[PDB]
């Protein structure tokens, strides 16, 4: 966005109130209303569809694959697409590289539940398409 | 014009065009006409309206970009190998399909179009 300077003071004024004030005036800990849909891409292992209040829009797909869990280290892969942008851009790649760290295989991920055999397991694909933000 | 191909079922080319014809009317952009699209396949002698990707890899297929109610074409694309002699008949198939396409687009917009002003006003 490109906003105007006279707002930017007032916006920085009102939110930095000591009885702090949002532009929509929520309580300081609130979030905004959303919508959450899933289970709608029946070719997939799982699907997802989420709706923001400003009309920001994404869908994340779940496809799986069986793999040898010894020849491969990363058992869980995230891959992200933002509409309107190049692959090469910054905000793409950082958010992309982030959720890999967020879903490291034994950090908050319980890869034993992913484990198929003593030799095999499940490669998963967190595949992300953002319409708009 | 932004495209997001989600689930793919074969017949992929004419699938697009029918989505386009919505989207231009979806803002109400100035235009002449409906434009319809459909892949129709050929198993040995027999035309197949509305093939799927299983059938697409199984035989020869042709997609037609058909304009409105007419007999004039926007898109015509053939990859597979086709014996010549069927082709006039093959082309004669898809029009009745294509006319039923822009048929079903129309009322479906219209019942939406009624839903506006009846509750707008």
């Amino acid at each position: 966005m490109s906003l105007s300077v006279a707002e930017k003071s007032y916006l920085y004024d009102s939110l930095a109130s000591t009885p702090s004030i949002r532009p929509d005036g929520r309580l300081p800990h609130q979030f905004r209303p959303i919508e959450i849909f899933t289970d709608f891409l029946p070719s997939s292992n799982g699907s997802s569809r989420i709706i923001a209040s400003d009309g920001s829009e994404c869908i994340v797909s779940i496809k799986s694959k069986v793999v040898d869990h010894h020849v491969e280290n990363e058992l869980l892969q995230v891959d992200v697409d933002i509409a309107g942008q190049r692959d090469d851009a910054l905000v793409v790649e950082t958010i992309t590289s982030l959720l890999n760290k967020v879903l490291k295989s034994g950090s908050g991920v319980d890869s034993s539940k992913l484990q198929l055999t003593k030799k095999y397991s499940f490669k998963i694909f967190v595949d992300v398409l953002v319409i708009s933000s | 014009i932004e495209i997001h191909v989600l689930e793919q079922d074969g017949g992929i080319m004419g699938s697009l065009i029918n989505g386009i014809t919505l989207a231009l009317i979806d803002a109400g952009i100035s235009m002449f006409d409906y434009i319809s699209g459909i892949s129709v396949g050929l198993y040995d002698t027999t035309p197949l309206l509305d093939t799927n990707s299983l059938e697409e890899n199984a035989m020869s297929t042709v997609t037609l970009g058909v304009v409105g109610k007419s007999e004039k074409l926007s898109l015509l694309l053939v990859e597979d190998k086709i014996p010549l002699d069927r082709l006039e008949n093959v082309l004669a198939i898809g029009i009745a399909g294509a006319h039923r396409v822009r048929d079903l687009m129309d009322e479906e917009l219209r019942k939406h179009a009624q839903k506006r002003v009846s509750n707008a006003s």
């Binding site: 849909f37 289970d39 | 009624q114």
Partner: peptide
């Protein structure tokens, strides 16, 4: 007394004065 509206609906892409109303291509 809340933070966010989280209401769920799973298994679907979507939930699913008279005058002349005309279309393009139409006479």
């Amino acid at each position: 007394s809340e933070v966010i509206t989280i209401t769920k609906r799973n298994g679907a892409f979507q939930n699913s004065s008279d005058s002349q109303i005309v279309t393009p291509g139409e006479l």
